[PDB]
Design a protein around this ligand. Structure first.
Ligand SMILES: Nc1nc2c(ncn2[C@@H]2O[C@H](COP(=O)(O)OP(=O)(O)O)[C@@H](O)[C@H]2O)c(=O)[nH]1
Ligand SMILES: [Mg+2]
Length: 186
């Protein structure tokens, strides 16, 4: 049994809490969604063993700049989240999230996670988005940002449809465990 700590950050409303509730329960939140989900644990097969991943939600607004980082000590991997239908939230992964995580946790790997993939793929939503002169974040743009912030992985997912949802957390686990292997004596 190995334990890892995963903290989820990103702009308000990109879907951090829904991501965590969907992973915890297997269902997109059916009732009231809290601002910040209480931290919880999940046991996941990994190699010949079991990883216990402890998941921490955060309040992403700038108002919480001093309270939110109190969650950061001893983190093994961060999920930096942006909505695939909000290009502004992608740019903030560079101007805000990468800078904050480098300041507090310079050695901790990051996974860049695109959320709300179902809306990116929803033809009617895309039309209405286009009426406001916005288009979805492309995978080309998301991968470019992955490199810009030196994230160890990138994935696009939907808490609503579960598309790539559990694999986003499998990606975070694999990155954390491989870093732990790299840091061990030979
Ligand atoms: N269509 C869709 N909506 C989502 C998804 N994830 C979150 N939402 C919606 O986005 C809004 C904000 O979600 P929330 O989890 O509170 O975002 P947070 O502020 O980052 O924690 C809510 O209306 C959610 O229902 C998703 O994968 N697909
Ligand atoms: Mg939330």
């Amino acid at each position: 049994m190995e334990s890892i700590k995963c903290v989820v950050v990103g702009d308000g409303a990109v879907g951090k809490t829904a991501l965590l509730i969907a992973y915890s329960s297997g269902c997109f939140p059916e009732d009231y969604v809290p601002t910040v989900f209480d931290n919880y644990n999940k046991n996941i097969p990994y190699g010949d063993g079991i990883v216990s991943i402890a998941l921490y939600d955060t309040a992403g607004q700038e108002d919480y700049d001093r309270l939110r980082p109190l969650s950061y000590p001893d983190t093994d991997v961060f999920l930096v989240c942006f909505s695939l239908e909000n290009p502004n939230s992608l740019e903030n992964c560079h101007s805000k999230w990468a800078e904050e995580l480098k300041h507090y946790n310079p050695d901790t790997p990051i996974v860049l996670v695109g959320t709300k993939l179902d809306l990116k793929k929803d033809e009617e939503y895309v039309k209405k988005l286009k009426e406001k002169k916005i288009s979805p974040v492309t995978t080309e743009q998301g991968q470019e940002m992955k490199d810009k912030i030196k994230a160890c992985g990138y994935i696009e997912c939907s808490a609503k449809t579960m598309e790539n949802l559990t694999e986003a957390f499998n990606m975070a686990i694999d990155i954390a465990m491989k870093q732990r292997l790299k840091d061990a004596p030979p």
